[PDB]
Design a protein around this ligand. Structure first.
Ligand SMILES: [Zn+2]
Ligand SMILES: [Zn+2]
Lengths: 359, 145, 396, 396, 359, 145
């Protein structure tokens, strides 16, 4: 019996901010560039009562709702916008889920590839026989950790995705993976800094030495291991900080648009970091058919890349029978203006010590 | 910040307070009596019906209906940590097991669906930060439709 | 058991207004020495004090008894403290009644105070007297409870389309009573029209909140003639307690009182019903016997208490108010000083605020006098009726 | 007036130790239901509760009465709260005595608790129950007051060179009493030598501080036989109050008690002297009649209270202790459970901690029994004797 | 020859923010309260290239333009929102004015009464014979030092006023003054804090123990010294943090509306702190007649009050002949939205270290 | 700092508290009775000796002697705002008018002069900062020799 994904879930903020609302204030980038070339018209706004833990536990609880009475054996939280810098937020999510304390547990960090790295850890724990199952979460509040006036502000979002790994009722078999990494400081966040920073100007030069190099290296590595090529895959899923990014990487690695399209979700969300490759995968599995082949290649700034190959099983049809797809979830939204978004995300420079709510 | 002179504060919470209530606040656990099966929220040590000490944790129903609802819009009554969202929709939620929970409704995407008798479900959200610096998490409700 | 008489009662005037120039000690002394003078009594005749406040979180002064005994200048005479929301004074009155009735003390000063302005923003502190881990720390206030209670009352007793009319008629009657009452915050204010009130905050049913201290002096019957010609007797009291948690109003198996209504909630206060029934049994009266009353007014809470107290039937208090039932010529005159809306509210003092107007009524000294008043009743609550007090006074 | 009997008394064991796994509600329930069982009584027979704690600043729970009535499962029965430093339970006992003696309630549960670990650092919170603007906010603690009181006692009554000997002998006797008392925090610990104690913290006279709840059940005399064969009667009580401000100990014209000593201060507690004299007059006893006692021990405070209480003359308590006077075979056995040093201290529970050991003594059930004990006395204080309570119990 | 005011000038930011723009975001106060009771419909917004020095030197240069070739003998800068906490901004303004270095010079601070305190210092320097003339400036950027979400945000403004004191061509003779002070911490700003903080909740209770007590004490003090009463004055000028404040204080001290009205300017400006009493005075002198009597009573939180009595001279008619009044100056305005106001006033929580303008 | 989310705090002091006590705390003003001339510290409204309300402010003597003294060295009992100076020398000071003040002795330049009966004088010092951010000032004592 093969090992892989059994169930999944997602958590996305409902508040939305149209790109023009940010551009009207800062006038620091072209509206047409962001809407048409990059492919993002609005982005998710984090409410004051939302964070990585609230989104993560929502996604996780939605995955576990598919498997009544599941006892948790391992739980790994992939995030680069962790609410805690010491102590594991994973243990907080575990406590909330209320399905066992005897679990392998940690937070995992490598930027946008944190979620795929957690997934690989969970696969290794099941495949080794160290556990019978394992829960991987990928979640980020990129909005919260992107500065007002930053060139990326208008498309910084947030999100969470949860994948349960096991060997009973598997809907996507985990076939193989390949990872790579290096010191490439294309983006950083030094200890203390709230805001994620760029290491150079934005554009294809920065993309060539990080995003494209590592994505290519991992994809070619895995395909070489499996003796496959782009033609052998029904779907390809990349990092989706922007709608343009998967299409661009696909053109760079010899995949074609119809292999990419079914993973695209982020036009109304923006960059969800660690969640983005996992959300692309979820968007595929929501409509995929038994027998189909998926290649998933994430990207973490810093930098590195995780490549994973999957095969969809017969069980996907039963899983799909009564399932709320991600496409439907993303229809739920509340529009807010720029001022309200900044209030909600705690980006006004207010007093260090508050006397009342407003003094 | 620049002058680290300690400021006076009568009260600082120990982690023990919230530690013991994770069942109640993360998982909506009240109590059920082992002898007579009566249910209560929040959690307790003595059954109120029969005065037995044989009481166990009980997972309350996480789905319900809005029994009664009231906007909170008055700036004068804005609590610290809750000033940013205005209005807040305060509600008494009747759970499917019969218990009633005092909470609020959030993420209202269609205002015409916010009415008495509307179905709701529990969600975990961030509440006012603790006086020991730990983030506070607990329940709120959303419309379920 | 022996009878206990009130020989004087007094409070610092305009309790819906603040006294920022005074300390809490100065404010306590004002009302205490006023009452002592009214009774022709020396401070050193006081054998004990029972005094109430919200708690130590306002002024950061705890263990307050000795501090009060020193401020009043009665040491070594003890001060027993009471910390019980808006019922603190009502509770301290009951404590003093027990002190005298026991025979342990013959002359006892009962009272309470609140100095909200010592706290930067008292409004957000008050929630600390609730089921804190499941309401206060989630940003849920007492005012939310009253808003919800009012909404439940109107939605379930068929008042849709007349909510504004009911609340405005109530608030207008309070303003009418306050206009000619010198100790009231709204003393001398012109009476706004019903329409102006409907279009104002809370349809005119928002209370006036300030600072005050107050007290009543209790004496054993056999001594009362030394201090007054016209003593007011305590017939009976009840104090009752249920969970602070608002959810429990709808389902509280912990509350053991037989013959409650089948359907209880916020609009039907089970704790308040139980309290009234116990009190009346102790006092040897029924609701029929009540000539004048006091209730904690705020939004529709006056209606809920009118029903709990037994003055009118379930769901009928709104119509009772609309038909003129609480006016001075009505079937049951209520809050004849103006109440919390007209006279004013200061949490820990509220019990004495009620008792003083009833005291005056029962001696024929009220500014809005109920002719031939024999029985007067204070219905007071704390939290959302987590505390409830019913105090029955007579004049013979 | 009618007599009031204690039918049971109990507290959560090892009160000098903490119970971090319990909530305050769970802890209260433990001792309450233990006492109910000891008395062969059902919770729903309780007609009222009088309960004490330090204040709302520890757990951020105020208006606690209803919360306790719900926790115990007695609603609608009321809980009257008491907030009075380390005398909270002593005061609540006196309140319950009044409740029963009045005839208003026949069966009353008296008690108190303290959950210090709910606060991050309780030690710096306690100062909030003082004359706060002139001590707490200047960084002056109750412990400073006791250190100073001890220094004054020794410097002015000629104990120079024997301070360590006095404090160590006291602390050693407390440890001896605690060793064989199962409910004590120092139960079963080996007795350190006098020399080891002298070279340790506070020469062995530092208290053990933890968490506890406790209660006693009071019943009208005519009902006591239903619940116990051996009732313990309340002979008389006094509670007295002076300023919290430590300076006033030396000069307090506000304290009107005739025949006080000429020279008063910290080493000579005027408030405590007054309290004892009042209590004994009410109880119909003198110090001669006392067979066994309890005092708030900490540093030299036990000595000051031994003198205030009338057990030995001014300045003689140190020598009384050195000569073996508080040992079980001594002239006046004192703190036979181990006291705050041996048994342990939890502020709001301390009054019941005293009363329980006296209750046991007066029924012949103590682990360090005083043969033929007829009269037992609790001397307790709050702040630096700003509150003072003296409670006199007998067995016939 | 009597001593007093010879010439004056004002400096006001041109950017404006309608009150409803702030209230729409924070919903923390009533629109009707601020517009109708308090009397403020819009407020001044500080541009990124404006501050106390920029406004101060504008006002001062406008006063000195009335007296060609004036050599400066003293210069005092009254402000509670000083660009420097050590070193005197007054010496920077002196340098800019380019009219002499040999001057008595310092910064003066007592909250909203800083400007009137500087004025008293200048009067004392001339009346003592220590100088022949002296330049007083009152200026504040209250907006810059009021926090986002503060109850006072919607009516925090900025401004500067300059008054030249001398004994040649005097237009308003300085008759007498009376000052008072005490420890009343009704508002504070501790060393370091950017934002000015309240010591208690807003309303008539706070007003009674600071604003009204000190204003009354100084006004009654001065009138007792001169054997005068409110009926003896053609104009009264108070602190003008709000249009409502002068009318309220007038009602409290037995002045009537017609005595106050000609000093009112702040309906479109908001609170200009140290500048506000001096701007009220300027607004009076722009239209006053020879012989008329003015009472000026300022208010500094902390707290204290400066009262000054003046008499208008024959020279006012010549001064008025070719003069741009303050009323006209305040017609120059540029409307901005909330987001833009927050950008301009540096109230977004951006990164402590900037890599470019937008990264 | 970087995340301006309001933290929970039960109690925040109004400026009114200290405003009314500036006489007591800056100037060592207690009270004197106009009828019987008895003196008290701290200030009060009713004379304790005779119960008259005719009471006026009284400037206490600012010189005195150490009546009793005790070091505070126990870290367990260090209050916030007072942790930096160790030991603290707590004292009851007997003023030249007979009143006694609870305070501490600071600036002890010669330790051999710190003893019972030593003459002291009042000084104004910074105490623990207020919960509304204002600096707190009040009395302490120094040896006067
Ligand atoms: Zn049961
Ligand atoms: Zn006197």
């Amino acid at each position: 019996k093969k090992i892989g994904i059994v169930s999944y879930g997602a958590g996305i903020p409902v508040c939305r901010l149209k790109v023009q609302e940010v551009i009207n204030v800062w006038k620091n980038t072209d509206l047409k560039l962001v809407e048409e070339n990059l492919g993002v018209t609005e982005r998710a706004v984090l409410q004051p009562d939302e964070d990585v833990i609230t989104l993560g536990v929502l996604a996780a609880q939605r995955a576990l709702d598919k498997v009544p009475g599941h006892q948790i054996e391992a739980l790994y939280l992939g995030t680069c916008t962790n609410p805690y810098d010491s102590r594991a937020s994973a243990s907080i999510i575990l406590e909330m889920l209320g399905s066992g304390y005897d679990a392998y547990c940690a937070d995992v960090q490598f930027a946008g590839k944190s979620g795929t790295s957690a997934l690989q850890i969970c696969q290794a724990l099941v495949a080794s026989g160290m556990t019978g199952s394992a829960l991987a979460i990928g979640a980020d509040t990129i909005n919260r950790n992107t500065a007002p006036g930053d060139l990326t502000e208008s498309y910084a979002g947030a999100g969470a995705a949860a994948l349960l790994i096991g060997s009973q009722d598997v809907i996507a078999e985990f076939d193989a993976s390949f990872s790579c990494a290096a010191d490439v400081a294309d983006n950083i966040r030094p200890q203390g800094d709230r805001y994620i920073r760029s290491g150079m100007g934005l554009g294809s030069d920065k993309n060539s030495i990080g995003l494209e190099d590592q994505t290519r290296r991992a994809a070619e590595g895995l395909m070489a291991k499996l003796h496959t090529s782009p033609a052998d895959y029904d779907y390809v899923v990349f990092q989706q900080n922007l709608v343009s990014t998967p299409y661009s990487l696909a053109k760079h690695l010899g995949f074609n648009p119809k292999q990419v399209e079914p993973g695209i979700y982020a036009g109304n969300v923006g960059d969800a970091g660690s969640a983005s490759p996992l959300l692309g995968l979820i968007n595929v599995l929501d409509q995929a058919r038994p027998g189909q082949k998926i290649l998933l290649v994430s990207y973490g700034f810093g930098a590195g890349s995780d490549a994973i190959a999957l095969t969809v099983t017969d069980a996907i049809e039963q899983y799909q029978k009564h399932n709320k797809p991600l496409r439907e979830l993303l229809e739920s939204k509340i529009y807010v203006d720029y001022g309200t978004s900044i209030k909600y995300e705690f980006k006004y420079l207010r007093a260090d010590y508050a006397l009342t709510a407003y003094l | 910040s620049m002058y680290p002179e300690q400021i006076h504060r009568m009260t600082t919470a120990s982690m023990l307070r919230e530690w013991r209530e994770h069942g109640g606040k993360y998982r909506l656990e009240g109590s059920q009596c082992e002898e007579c099966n009566e249910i209560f929220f929040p959690r307790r040590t003595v059954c109120g019906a029969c005065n037995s000490l044989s009481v166990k944790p009980y997972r309350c129903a996480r789905s319900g209906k809005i029994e009664v609802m009231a906007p909170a819009e008055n700036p004068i009554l804005a609590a610290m940590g809750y000033g940013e969202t205005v209005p807040r929709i305060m509600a008494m939620v009747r759970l499917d097991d019969g218990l009633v929970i005092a909470s609020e409704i959030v993420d209202v995407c269609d205002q015409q669906q916010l009415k008495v008798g509307a179905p709701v479900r529990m969600v975990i959200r961030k509440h006012v930060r603790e006086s020991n610096l730990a983030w506070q998490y607990a329940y709120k409700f959303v419309l379920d439709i | 058991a022996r009878r206990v008489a009130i020989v004087s009662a007094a409070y610092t005037p305009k309790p819906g207004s603040s006294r920022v120039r005074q300390t809490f000690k100065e404010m306590i002394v004002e009302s205490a020495y006023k009452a002592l003078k009214d009774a022709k009594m020396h401070p050193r005749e006081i054998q004990a004090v029972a005094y109430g406040y919200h708690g130590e979180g306002i002024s950061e002064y705890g263990g307050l008894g000795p501090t009060i005994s020193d401020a009043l200048g009665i040491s070594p005479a003890p001060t027993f403290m009471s910390t019980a929301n808006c019922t603190s004074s009502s509770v301290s009155f009951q404590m003093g009644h027990q002190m005298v009735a026991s025979g342990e003390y013959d002359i006892v000063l009962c009272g309470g105070f609140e100095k909200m302005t010592d706290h930067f923003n008292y409004a957000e502190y008050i929630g600390s007297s609730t089921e804190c881990e499941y309401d206060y720390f989630l940003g849920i206030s007492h005012t939310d409870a009253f808003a919800l209670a009012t909404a439940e009352y109107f939605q379930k007793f068929g008042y849709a389309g007349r909510e504004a009319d009911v609340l405005a008629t109530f608030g207008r009657q309070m303003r009418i009573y306050a206009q000619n009452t010198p100790t009231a915050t709204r003393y001398g204010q012109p009476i706004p029209s019903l329409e102006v009130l409907k279009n104002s905050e809370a349809c005119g049913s928002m209370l006036a909140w300030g600072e005050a201290s107050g007290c009543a002096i209790l004496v054993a019957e056999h001594l009362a003639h030394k201090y007054t010609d016209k003593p007011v007797f305590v017939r009976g009291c009840a104090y009752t307690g249920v969970s602070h948690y608002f959810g429990t109003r709808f389902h509280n198996p912990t509350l053991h009182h037989p013959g409650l209504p089948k359907d209880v909630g916020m609009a039907v206060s089970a704790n308040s019903i139980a309290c009234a029934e116990i009190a009346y049994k102790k006092a040897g009266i029924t609701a029929k016997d009540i000539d004048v009353a006091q209730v904690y007014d705020l939004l529709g809470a006056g209606l809920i208490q009118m029903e709990s107290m037994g003055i009118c039937g379930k769901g009928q208090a709104g119509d009772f108010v609309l038909e003129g039932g609480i006016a001075l010529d009505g079937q049951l005159p209520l809050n004849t000083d103006g109440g919390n809306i007209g006279r004013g509210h200061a949490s820990g003092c509220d019990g004495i605020l009620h008792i003083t107007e009833l005291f005056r009524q029962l001696r024929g000294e009220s500014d809005n006098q109920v002719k031939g008043a024999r029985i007067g009743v204070s219905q007071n609550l704390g939290g959302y009726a987590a505390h409830n007090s019913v105090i029955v006074l007579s004049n013979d």
